[PDB]
Symmetry: D2
Subunit: 143 residues, 4 copies
Amino acid sequence: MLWKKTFTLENLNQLCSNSAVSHLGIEISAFGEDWIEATMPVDHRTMQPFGVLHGGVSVALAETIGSLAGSLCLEEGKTVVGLDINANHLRPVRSGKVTARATPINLGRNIQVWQIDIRTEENKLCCVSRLTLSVINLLEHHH
Amino acid sequence: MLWKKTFTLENLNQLCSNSAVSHLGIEISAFGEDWIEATMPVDHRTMQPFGVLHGGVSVALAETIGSLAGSLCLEEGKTVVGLDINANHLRPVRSGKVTARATPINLGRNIQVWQIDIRTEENKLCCVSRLTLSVINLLE
Amino acid sequence: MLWKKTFTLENLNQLCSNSAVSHLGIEISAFGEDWIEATMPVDHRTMQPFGVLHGGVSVALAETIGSLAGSLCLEEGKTVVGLDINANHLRPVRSGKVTARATPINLGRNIQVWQIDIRTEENKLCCVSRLTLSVINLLEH
Amino acid sequence: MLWKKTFTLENLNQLCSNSAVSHLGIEISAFGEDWIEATMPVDHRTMQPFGVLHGGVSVALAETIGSLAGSLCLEEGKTVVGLDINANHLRPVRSGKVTARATPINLGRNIQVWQIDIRTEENKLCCVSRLTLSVINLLEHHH
């Protein structure tokens, strides 16, 4: 099992409240031994001005679930900071909710690399992303 | 000039109402000869739970302003589709507003590449992004 | 299956000769129903100065196998143009050959997106890459 | 200012000898206060079968010049490792030499981000790239 922190979906969702995450309707929704998922609605909150899911907001979803995932793979007292992200948009989404699944590509001492695949409710791949994170020690004095 | 469509900031801001763009408090805020800017507040709509600007939302800002810029560089009957984007987050932002400026790298017949630089109110670069768009001929 | 062109490894290697591909000692090495591989030695032709495989060169390999894979998924009279590529380097490589496997992510009408994984001799992932290609119709282009 | 190591272009070219850098005909060719350049011939060593400069080889040139630049900004005892790179290929090149310039975007304690722009001898922009580097310390014992 990948995780080093103990958590529940309910506790994760509470932590994310009052932030860009809750503001965008994003919900941490499911997890397994080595992946975790978040969903997000396609509606006026998340669409670009022509009735489709805003591609930039898709990336917001990817960075959210990947950073969360990366932190859960570290012991208490450590967490991650997003360094960079890239993504390809593969198809437009007009309705329903999308689901982003984060899976680890490499978990280093200092650097983590995560894959995030975002799929429509029809299970079609609509976005693929790769995220690079830095591992930080929370007890270091300068923060 | 760069622009092929006529537009005003008020018009552009009306086009973006009741969407992800207005939902994030993003405002199309200025433009020149070959650049255009949008602003976004750093607050509870746009921050991580832990109180810094959400880097994913900076990307949303970047894609908004670059795609808009891309469409303005095309004649009527043509538009753009977001193909890919990448970004580096350079520094944390904890308050104020940030400004994203889109400038063109290459405007081709089929493909456009745009640079987006996002800066803090202290004029510091906090995020850089490159955006690739596909040019589509709607009627033709 | 995946491929729309018939081909052999021998034919592919020959087409690639007297170019950057052969200059780098890259060889098209195996394929399956929906993936294709190339190998590349780690020696003085491909190392950066302090004795490890050069990351940029690893990306040249990725773009090589991804683009070839792309072209083999199209019918005659069609081909691909590299639009962009990105990669993460995961670990240093000091010897042997590395192997790059291309697998498709999405093959659309006008754009193809390809995944490329590069692994060492002990099957360790040393580089991961995504490549974006433009589909061109040679008969109007 | 930017540079923390003392160097000349001859030193740098000496350092790159008998490596992928020399193998590709890449030459360190100029530098200023805030940037450094390298050239590379477009010929059979560097073209793809279709007779244009190999895009992957352009990225090799970008990573080369950015990583070298990255190490030159650091005190003796420290250097860099490539973490990731991305590039867009903007136009075919079929002859002459290309020139790549690395200019820093942000230099952190642990992470550096570099811009590389590659141009043809007509000074047309043919490739833009961004490189992320990790800062390492070579002088730690033991350890």
